[PDB]
Amino acid sequence: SRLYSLLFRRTSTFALTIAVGALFFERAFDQGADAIYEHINEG
Amino acid sequence: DLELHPPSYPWSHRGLLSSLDHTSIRRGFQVYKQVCSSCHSMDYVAYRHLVGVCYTEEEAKALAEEVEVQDGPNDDGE
Amino acid sequence: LHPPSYPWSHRGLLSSLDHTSIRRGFQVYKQVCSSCHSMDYVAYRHLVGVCYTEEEAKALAEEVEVQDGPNDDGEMFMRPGKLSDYFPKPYPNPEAARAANNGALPPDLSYIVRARHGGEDYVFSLLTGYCEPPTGVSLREGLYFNPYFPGQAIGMAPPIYTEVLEYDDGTPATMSQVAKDVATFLRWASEPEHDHRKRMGLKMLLMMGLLLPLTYAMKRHKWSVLKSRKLAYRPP
Amino acid sequence: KGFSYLVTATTTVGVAYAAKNVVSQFVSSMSASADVLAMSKIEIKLSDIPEGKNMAFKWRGKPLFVRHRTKKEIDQEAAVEVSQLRDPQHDLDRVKKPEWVILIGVCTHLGCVPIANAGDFGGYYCPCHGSHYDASGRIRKGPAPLNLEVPAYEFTSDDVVVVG
Amino acid sequence: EFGNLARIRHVISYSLSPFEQRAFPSYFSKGIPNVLRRTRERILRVAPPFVVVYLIYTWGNQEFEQSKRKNPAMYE
Amino acid sequence: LSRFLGPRYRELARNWIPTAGMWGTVGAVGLVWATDWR
Amino acid sequence: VDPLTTVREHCEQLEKCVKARERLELCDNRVSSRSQTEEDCTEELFDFLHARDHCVAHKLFKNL
Amino acid sequence: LDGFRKWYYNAAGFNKLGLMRDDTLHETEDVKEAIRRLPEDLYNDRMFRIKRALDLTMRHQILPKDQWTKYEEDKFYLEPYLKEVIRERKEREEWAK
Amino acid sequence: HPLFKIINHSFIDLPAPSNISSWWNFGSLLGVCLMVQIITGLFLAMHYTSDTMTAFSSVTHICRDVNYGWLIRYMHANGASMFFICLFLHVGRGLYYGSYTFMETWNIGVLLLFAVMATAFMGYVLPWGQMSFWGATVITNLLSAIPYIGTTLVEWIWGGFSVDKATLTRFFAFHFILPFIIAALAIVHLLFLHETGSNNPTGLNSDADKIPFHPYYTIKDILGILIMFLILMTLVLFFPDMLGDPDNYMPANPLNTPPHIKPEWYFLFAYAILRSIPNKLGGVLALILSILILALMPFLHTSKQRSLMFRPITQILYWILVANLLILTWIGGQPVEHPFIIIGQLASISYFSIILILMPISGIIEDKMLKLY
Amino acid sequence: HPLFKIINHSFIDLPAPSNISSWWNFGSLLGVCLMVQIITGLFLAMHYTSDTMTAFSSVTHICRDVNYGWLIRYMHANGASMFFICLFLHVGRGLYYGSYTFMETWNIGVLLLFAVMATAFMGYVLPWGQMSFWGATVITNLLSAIPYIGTTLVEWIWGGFSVDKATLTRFFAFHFILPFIIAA
């Protein structure tokens, strides 16, 4: 419940959480996928 | 035309997420050169396009060195 | 130096190019200017004009064997040309020209007149304006003093002299006659449509002189109503 | 609310991550065509000039000017006041051979070709806005802020100047 | 749209048929005198700037010309 | 602008300031993840 | 005989070209007048040139 | 200065088209309000004059010089009213801040 | 009928002021021109390639062989020139008669101008002549002025180290799209205007005297179209190169440059402004402001009268502004040397001081003369 | 606001039936596909050359040397296929649910369908493969069927005796210009 009241209730903060999250999510997604591709293709 | 249909084979890249075996691409590039290069050329392909673990760049340039024709050694001397 | 004015006949508003001269200027190019210059974009088909009809052009088309045709490997020059054959080139490669031009470049002259500010005049002036270098003149390589030339170091070798060539028409081949005649041809080629257009422009002027007062009369009909409207204020 | 919105926030990042990716490749497409930016080669001979000869080489669509400097040229360029230069770069600072100067022909100002044998200070000049470059290619007069560029010639031996 | 535009009252507006009025009232004859009047009224405020300009252009050209003009005495 | 000169007007802005910074801030961080500047 | 030469000569004969030539002659003489000087005369040369040339075109093309 | 005013007046020439000064004030909201309040007679008159000008402008003609509204003749009808409207906006603004 | 209702609503039963002069024709002319530029551009694009290899050639072929190519190509070039003539007169009408108080229409407007300017550079660079090449490098380098991200941006646009084929092909698309782009932005223009209706030269509320558009301002637009076509065809069929620079017919010398390089007339002054500011960046900014100062124009109106019909001092200042705009157009042409430079510097100072300072002060003085202030 | 009023009037406050199924999505998909095609087509047009010597070479250069050029090309081709899938399902929805009683909408639709088929045909001619050339000759030949003016019309379109460069270049121009008419 705290999160809603803190980062998801004020639209400005909603955007902030979205943008920040997206900033981190991507690199990771790329890494994970890339890694998987690599494990999947060992050569 | 009745053509015996190609008997689908199990290629290491046949799968939905299955990539190519790059050692096989390197061996097949050798095949082209020694055998078919006689009567077939990868025009749209270039030694720079040979960038892949199959062949690294410096060595590829050596391949690039091997070939030596119509570069235009002489522009006035054509 | 600002090239002065010149009374070119074709330049007349409704008048057109004198093909006879044009023809003569094509000869001048073929016998003198083609050794370092070529009308690449011009073809024997383009060359067609009263100056040279396709038939005459054919003669010229067959008059050349240079790079008109290729060989088993399409190298060097291997066969003569025909109507579709484009104008022959003095050089198969830019380097060739550069080599045979003091290292400098003899520009193909297809759009040369258009290219040069006040081209027709410039051309005439350059070809016939070497004049005299009074002082401080150090022509380095195959250059020719010409105040008309931007640097007075043209390097466009003066290729025209009294009777430089011989006009087939027999018109005395004086340097100027030669210069003026070739000028016409060069101009003709630069704008193969000069004559074509001016005829359109004449038809356009006649049609606009017919249509502008009539459309003005319509407009003044439909606007007369208002332009005669009389307003009156009649407070009760 | 936090459960429902967290789903909205989750989805957004995902879309946001895909949207940046799609837009990124597109943007990248118009980046340098790999084939043409696959062209970084070069070949030059320093023995092609007797004296005072500027020699561009159209490298990467850019003039690889290689002007020559006679001792006289060499003598004046050194005489030029480096500090007083618009761009402090002594003639030798841009050349490892006084008799040999190599420059890139893009006017610091708006990128035209600076014709040589022109310019009040001598050497180069740019018909676009009147920038005069000395034989060293230093902007001495004009709307040209920086001096002409000096490529990595890295001459190996008098015989061959790499000029990367 | 027409209607519901302005509360204009008592403004009788007589008019005449297009085909009834002379087709093309002389413009040069009647209109241009007033046009002359019209143009002369404003020109008195329009050309003055341009009057100045031409002068600038003229002076500039010759000035630049003299600037280029070299003096034999210079470096003589 | 004359009208903008007001004490309450000022109070409103002061109360509005934090939110303004936030959106700009988000946009700022956004630009970063947007370009990965180099 | 190139009419160009003739016309040029003729124009030169024109008193206007004569005076323009006077200038050029005085000026080309001036070219040789001093050595350390920079009396190139290119300017005066061009002066006469254009003047005469105008006359030339004024009466050359017709002969042409 | 007043003489200069009269000169400007002629130069403005809005007199020529046959319009008073208040006639030309751009219809800013404020102006709009005042116009509305105008006693009907003036409003209708204003309209007549304005419309006449439009018609005259269309024909590129100006009224007989005599008919031109003389500087002296020109009176300010909208202004008295406009002043109030402006003051009104002003009053609201500070009660606003 | 829901398609005929909009057409009726914008062209037939639209209430227009009865007293608008010929100037008000010019915007409609612009729409006709855009159409012309675009259609001509199509054929120009036809038989044309974006290849430095064949771009300059097929075009020469258009000039030489393409059926009526010489006609369509020179109609396209002189129609771009006619577009900028009508654009400048449209903007001058908007400045003189106080039409900038329609602020949304003006902003769609000011943007429209920047766009049209670009399409010019686009169309310009496309034939791949000597002048196109050296002109492109110049303005592309203008971008390098940017304080931090400049170099990257320039290289991005160029698509490489220096303008080369990479540029030609992409510039081709923008020059195929910006036209479509500007076209739409204009549509926005027409909407943001009908909400308010057109202005009249007296600057007064023309609600008492409005007439239909079909029979009154349609035949007037047809007559203006006919006169503009007369000027365009006498520009094409009689003097096809009085506005261009002969350099065009020179295949780009990737290596050599035109001793005298000049941007085209329509932008000549723009660059004149640049040449004036000593600092490169300053020039770029001032240049931009030159166009942008217009957008800034609706916030500088300090008069109680909308139009300049009854405002003689601001009329004098307006014609001085037109005068030194013509002066800046001339200076751009002149080379870099005394005294062209000083005039350029003053003319730019006078231009910015008349638009920024002198006109609102004059409007205050004019309001004081009518016992309004 | 007169620009936002139309956008509100057509996309926000538009009264729509509450019970329309997923089939009513398809037309909006078609619009998206149109934009996608236009966008991908624009990024094919910055490298494609409409010359019979260089068209196949330019397509291979797009696939092999342009960064993610294979992605944009195959997105364009499979987006044309997706366009026709969504078009067929849109027409099938219109036939099944009796939506053809909106007669003006239906007639503008069948005009759009004709324009989309012509655009896709000339676009498939554009890469200048073996299949494109023989396919073009075939359908262009279709026109020759016309009883009296057929031969002329065919030759006109071809721009010559037989499809050759003359065709390719005008097919590039027409394939470029028709999706904007489709948008209008």
Ligand code: HEC
């Ligand atoms: C002796 C020279 C030569 C060699 C070496 C050579 N080829 Fe060929 N190849 C030809 C010729 C000639 C044809 C065309 C024959 C025809 O069309 O009748 C051809 C045709 C083909 C074709 C096209 C078949 C079709 O249906 O069009 C393929 C695939 C092919 N070869 C594969 C290969 C491969 C893989 C190699 C390397 C092992 C190779 N070739 C080596 C000469 C050669």
Ligand code: HEC
């Ligand atoms: C036998 C040699 C030769 C002949 C004959 C010749 N030229 Fe040239 N021309 C040159 C050379 C060499 C250059 C290169 C000069 C340079 O690039 O500095 C040149 C360059 C030019 C230029 C470019 C100058 C400029 O303004 O940029 C023009 C124009 C020109 N020639 C015109 C002509 C005309 C007109 C004729 C005959 C009617 C002619 N030439 C005949 C050798 C010749």
Ligand code: HEM
């Ligand atoms: C979408 C429509 C348009 C298309 C397809 C188009 C296409 C082209 C093409 C192919 C050329 C090169 C041929 C030539 O050299 O003339 C060109 C040149 C040009 N275009 Fe456009 N154009 C369009 C609209 C415009 C517009 C609206 C303008 C005006 C802003 C414009 C201005 C120019 C200019 C100035 C040139 C250079 C002409 C020259 O060589 O002197 N074009 N256009």
Ligand code: HEM
């Ligand atoms: C793409 C170029 C442009 C086109 C095609 C265009 C077209 C038009 C058209 C058709 C009209 C309606 C006719 C008219 O009012 O006379 C109009 C009105 C107007 N335009 Fe433009 N315009 C363009 C650029 C501009 C620019 C740059 C400005 C600003 C300087 C501008 C300012 C105006 C104004 C103020 C009006 C209303 C004028 C009035 O009716 O009183 N336009 N425009």
Ligand code: HEM
């Ligand atoms: C105005 C927007 C468009 C442009 C500029 C455009 C441009 C192009 C270009 C340059 C090609 C050749 C490159 C290639 O081989 O893929 C092409 C191919 C093609 N286009 Fe378009 N196109 C547009 C819209 C469309 C639309 C709306 C359709 C669907 C009806 C379409 C269908 C195709 C097809 C089927 C091909 C052949 C793809 C293949 O080689 O397999 N295009 N288009």
